[model samples]
Target: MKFILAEKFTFDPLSNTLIDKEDSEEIIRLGSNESRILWLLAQRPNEVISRNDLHDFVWREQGFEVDDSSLTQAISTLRKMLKDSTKSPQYVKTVPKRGYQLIARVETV
Candidate 1:
């Protein structure tokens, strides 16, 4: 039950789709794990969310095993889909040793 507004991108948890608002026809599909990671980050925009926490909520709590590499892959996939640069991100930002943060302003409505 999460819907996030970040810049021109909108995420609908129910449909598990990440949409480009400017181009409504453009829809990005993410894997279940990737979508979960995105949802969590969007849930706490601008806040540093630790990988451990991400693991706990997105995987462990869901009865999935925690795979560090999988989380990295998921984040990379998300960045690519969002067209966000890891060097200079427009949406997701890395928080070195801490976790990741959604740099975009997420609107709840």
Candidate 2:
């Protein structure tokens, strides 16, 4: 299993599932776009990934011409699935015009 943000959360990119580690219950399964974004941020925890970079990596490859607003919607969705809030972010944090950052420690098991 792949671990992201914290030990309590287990994320499987292949299956697009993020679950609670305690009971191993699936919290939510991410969409293609959401998984791409989450994986990108998790790969670079605490480091700010640029919006343009994210757009190129996640959207452009999918043949989608995306903007910052699109990114925002994806982030919002991921946050909700992670049981995180933008106002008091736990896993993902917005870096204003820059981009988003994974504020939690990531690992693999």
Candidate 3:
């Protein structure tokens, strides 16, 4: 399935890339873990998803074990790729002491 994120970026799961809806040439490929994490978050946009829950779904379910820092790194890279930042994130939101959420609206395409 393909997803339109924030009404601007398109998530291509098969290619593991995020593309700008208005510009096909403008796209960013994601690392495997990063893609997985993003997909999970997108599965429920605007909802806070705990770090532990992410770890379980993104890694544990894949027959892999990773450090919490791995998730952090993925999130950081994802934000950077999305041209988003912690201070003024328009796509991904970081909730202090809680978890994370996809600030963007997700739509199936």
Candidate 4:
């Protein structure tokens, strides 16, 4: 993933973007939920992010109702934007019923 911080931040799959020592942003700009999901995946690239993990981390509050289809749709859009092919991913990867994973190198500029 590649990144550029010109007033605003921008990112791509060429490199992962580390804005600060403790913060890393993926080049893909997304809505709040999508952004958070991407951030988690970027932080743990190549590892499967379990469904329970995503639900727990993305929505820490218990009893919050979240539709499974929502995550599925978000993953679809994220994959499309990242140009990640589920058929042959170069960025985001699907882990069947488990969840997703970021499988791309991040670069900061």
Candidate 5:
């Protein structure tokens, strides 16, 4: 799947961390989960990624009985982190009441 680390982030797959390399602020965040989610969204930019798909992808066969709060939270956090706006979005687009679509230019270095 496609992955785009924002202009501010540089990822080191071996260490599973995101670094703000250019800033020299020495900011480092570790984890592949958020990257994984971003990768999937970047993969199908301009195409809706339904909530059900994300549930299956992230939760992986967990019964639907599980609460959906996590997915909502992830999307909310992702949008905020990406500086995306639903009103006049640049990175992600909302599908009315359905789902989200990635709409940003993903630069893979």
Candidate 6:
């Protein structure tokens, strides 16, 4: 499936890339786990998702045993690729003492 995030980027889960809406040639490739993390967050845009839940969905459930840092690193790459600032983000936002949230307007067709 394909998704439009923030009305500016098109997310292609299959290809593991994010393309600029205005410039399709400007594509940003995502890591294996990076794509999964973004897909998970996209499922619930603007909603807070706990790190624990992300950990389980992206790793544990897949028969992989990972640590907390793995989740942190995955999210980090997503933010950098999307150009989402940690302090004032337009895509992923960190909810202190709570979880992470995708500050995006998502659309699918």
Q: Write the per-residue lDDT of candidate 1 for residues 26-109, one digit (tens) a residue.
A: 778877887888888888778899999988888899888956887888899988888888897888898889989988888876
Compared with the true structure, model 4 gives a TM-score of 0.65
Models 1 onward score TM values of 0.90, 0.89, 0.92, 0.65, 0.66, 0.92
Ranked by TM-score from best down, the candidates are 6, 3, 1, 2, 5, 4
Off by over 4 Å in 6: none
Please list the C-alpha lDDT of all candidates, in the order they appear.
Answer: 0.83, 0.82, 0.88, 0.62, 0.62, 0.89
Q: Show the colliding residue pairs in model 3.
A: none
Clashing pairs in 1: none
**Model 1 lowest lDDT segment of ten:** 1-10
Q: Give one digit per residue, the lDDT tens place, for model 5 in 6-72.
A: 4555545445455554655664553344445566676666678887777676566544344667777
Q: Candidate 5: minimum summed lDDT over ten consecutive residues — where?
A: 1-10
| Alpha-carbon shift of residue 59 in model 6 (angstroms) | 0.8
Candidate 4 residue lDDT tens string, 1-109: 4443222335543343323222344333455556557767766767899977876666654455687776788778766655557797777778888888876764355
Error of 1 at 103 (Å): 1.0
lDDT of 2: 0.82
Candidate 1 regions exceeding 4 Å error are 1-4
RMSD of each: 1.5, 1.6, 1.3, 7.8, 3.6, 1.2
